[PDB]
Subunit: 280 residues, 4 copies
């Protein structure tokens, strides 16, 4: 299997001014869409297993499903636990052979966030897998919110996370108003924190703002909603036109194909196309 | 894992006048729908991997996906290769640890069908997995067709198949005209062939004809199209009502739930509910 | 697989006045000897993978070898990492699916021992596997006693599930007969109130083992004496027939004599028949 | 894993005037000896799992043990079932993911041998693994030659990829020096035109091996001589120190001496460096 530490991927992206796309998976077709995109683009990629799919499918089953679809894949892949709020769940992903974990202590006090994140990072460092933490809440779309540079620095130094999620103008879900990222804040963090930044709420952010953020040290861009939209739209083109089309290979296949093209588009936006060669 | 030879399942069904449902799988949600149904019904079940899903997902990946979803399953499960027209493909399923295989030589001459089916059966017998063969073409829905008792007997004795697919009034797909099964022919085969019969084209056959066929020795009923219809209808209830519902857990979840209820209905039709206790 | 948390095994032993034998494995035959013994005795067992076998065979290979021999085994089995002096190595055992780990910080300062042992314990608790730590050096026989207060403090700060302490044993063939610190064990039974692990279990007189178990020893580590038994079995064959090249015969005999030693230890420990308690 | 069809290995050897060594495994140390040898020599190798080790350790466990030791191996490896006299057992090896099988019908009538061997070969061809059959009994040394016409007929009716024939070898330690039937091998090279398997390869003089390989022997089976080497290594340690209980030392030495024997056989066979041809 071509599985690689998320730290190896993110640091290479960070050092060369591109980003790794971190694409949320939900089932078989979504896994295949992402992997086929990465393989086509000769790009390293992260597949994110988050809280919702863990509640529906289970953590270990989703890991095993990825494994089952890796047989023909040659590009660097990293399975990443997204938005974990439990030390136990994060350790379960470690035990199941994930290449990256996010412990999201962002709803905890500063001190508790630090304590658990550091514990998770010490395990990740020991086993050469990536660790992500978050300082500052990032909510849903449905000035004060922005993470300070000093807070990011202190959190970063106390936890030793490999890559850091901060609050910089994004939110999860379909954007009601177009977001405007805190570019000055990203630049400060690049100079002072000096760690790869993770952009949460990557779906629906204008392309130009993504490209700029990446030049300022965003090295991981999380995308979920926009892929689910693409998948759903592909399914709809089929079932709306032919409600009695019962061949799942056709209806879900189209969802898969449309999602694949979205993932290709994101890989290219992020600058990660061709970068598989850097890891061979 | 609670995996059991398809021969053990089918013979028990045959000996006690019920049938094992053989439910075609296509992806993660369809697997889960079938397994959750079987577990709820305390029923033995077959999961069929056929030609279409092998072309989309691959043979080994689908096997591995089933494995990944078996963690919480206690009822007897048998993974079955459906409609294989290649000795190689059938041997690949054997190598991948299937519990049952169908080599479908029905488009070959009688002698070639016999030759390859026998070869497949000798391997199946050696490894204690189920083997299914077919004599007589069963086409699509879109007197002469009916398999003779003598042909079924000769094929059966030359091949040593464990369970036998024959042409008895069904066809694959959505029925244009309601089918009428060849009940007299089934009764002859029960008395003379004396092997469990497999009913292909089980989707959309009237319940009463299914129940009667089972009393005449049909012990495996294959169902695919009707489950795909149920899955598709569940997805449609969601996406038609809310085209912008992008939570796959909701849209595909509903497909999964509606398919699960169809599978429950089929298990009960077939008489296999509660029969897990017979194998504990 | 019939794999069980080391904590489940040890707590049950501790509550019921018996001990789990923790038998060191080295290769295929030694694994099978221990498993065949446990199955015969219907006993829960720990198989210990320690530093020596990790250097020779590798951590993950030895884990996978145990897995390969578990096909016909029904009794509770716990794979346990022995004498780990590295957080990394201990995390590797966790990642490879061990059911128990010992982080042995006994060569570190009290504070460092506590710090790393606690980190290890938090991971073990999260994943429902056993954690063992050690306070007090336990050396070799070729070459003292842990205080009750130190054992208590270490135990409460680390949250280990079972605790190795220095109570008069040593690793290796004993030159002189050991005498266990029974008074100290008894204090610990009342004050520390955790299952105790006895290191250096090889060659300890049976009656001292039985008494130690009543005072709260719930895990007894045995390695040298099994390797002696294995080596003696091989010798009976090769000394008698130097040209006996059938390994099934020479190493088979090592395996059989080792199996009987393991049976003897299981029965000494009181763990025979106890598989029933965990079904 | 660097696992390769036995047919790919043997055909390449046959085409290039060398042979693949087929080394019998018995346990962890013997597996590692063979693999470490192959890796050192950058040689393709077969590891043979035969009847004895199946009775002691089990077919699937030995397969899984090899898997566990392949983590650091880069050279072509083929796991091969040796001396199977059962269609069921041969199918079990196929199901467990072996890269080559021998169905040995040599104690059956010609017709039965053909029937079962052909059935086995059809499965092997379907799954791209090697198939070996045998025509002519090959016995033991403690206790003849296959005709060219019989070898041809058997070969054409079974479609085996490589063929074991009776050409003057026997299993075990040779009492008297063997003399291979070189004239008969040479006939077969021109007429049968299939890679030949040499059973009873232990103790065959080096020069006779080299000549046999030029006449189309492309697989040489070696077991007894490796078990001798392993046993001699163990003896050097236990005879000198009966109380040496460190298995890493006693069995380690067996492993080291066996490794050197395997290196010697690889080089004899001409397979050193040949890993390059398959990358
Ligand atoms: O931060 C993210 C990007 O968000 P958008 O795609 O909406 O822009 C992801 O990492 C999601 O937050 C994730 O879907 C929630 S769960 O853990 O998967 O349940
Ligand atoms: O015989 C069957 C029942 O048919 P219906 O469900 O239409 O009534 C199945 O066994 C199918 O024939 C199968 O879907 C084709 S493939 O091999 O899966 O591609
Ligand atoms: O403590 C033990 C008992 O010692 P005895 O058998 O001599 O009485 C074991 O747990 C050993 O200490 C172990 O062999 C060392 S290593 O880690 O396996 O290298
Ligand atoms: O043919 C062989 C070479 O014999 P020598 O090493 O004595 O020369 C091997 O293939 C053996 O025949 C094998 O040990 C028997 S078993 O099947 O492993 O029990
Ligand atoms: Na968003
Ligand atoms: Na139908
Ligand atoms: Na000792
Ligand atoms: Na010989
Ligand atoms: Zn997020
Ligand atoms: Zn059909
Ligand atoms: Zn010790
Ligand atoms: Zn032989």
């Amino acid at each position: 299997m071509s599985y690689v530490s998320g730290n190896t991927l993110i640091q290479h992206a960070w050092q060369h001014g591109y980003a790794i796309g971190a694409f949320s998976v939900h089932n078989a077709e979504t896994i295949r869409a992402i992997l086929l995109a990465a393989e086509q683009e000769q790009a390293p990629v992260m597949l994110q297993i988050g809280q919702k799919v863990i509640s529906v499918m289970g953590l270990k089953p989703m890991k095993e499903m990825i494994d089952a679809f890796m047989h023909d894949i040659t590009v660097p892949v990293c399975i990443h636990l997204d938005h974990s709020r439990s030390f136990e769940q994060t350790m379960e992903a470690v035990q199941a052979g994930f290449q990256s974990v996010m412990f999201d202590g962002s709803h905890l006090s500063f001190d508790e966030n630090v304590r658990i994140t550091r514990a998770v990072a010490d395990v990740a460092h020991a086993l050469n897998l990536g660790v992500e933490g978050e300082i500052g809440k990032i909510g849903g779309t449905e000035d004060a919110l922005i993470t300070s540079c000093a807070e990011a620095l202190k959190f970063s130094e106390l936890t030793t996370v490999d890559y850091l999620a901060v609050s910089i103008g994004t939110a999860h879900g379909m954007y009601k108003q177009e977001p405007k990222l805190a570019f000055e804040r990203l630049q400060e963090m690049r100079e002072i924190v000096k760690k790869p930044i993770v952009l949460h709420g990557g779906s629906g952010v204008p392309d130009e703002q993504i490209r700029r953020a990446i030049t300022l040290g965003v090295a991981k861009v999380n995308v979920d909603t926009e892929l689910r939209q693409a998948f759903t739209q592909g399914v709809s083109e089929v079932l709306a036109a032919s409600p009695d089309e019962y061949v799942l290979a056709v209806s879900l296949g189209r969802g898969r194909d449309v999602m694949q093209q979205k993932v290709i588009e994101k890989i290219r936006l992020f600058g990660s196309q061709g970068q598989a060669a850097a890891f061979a």
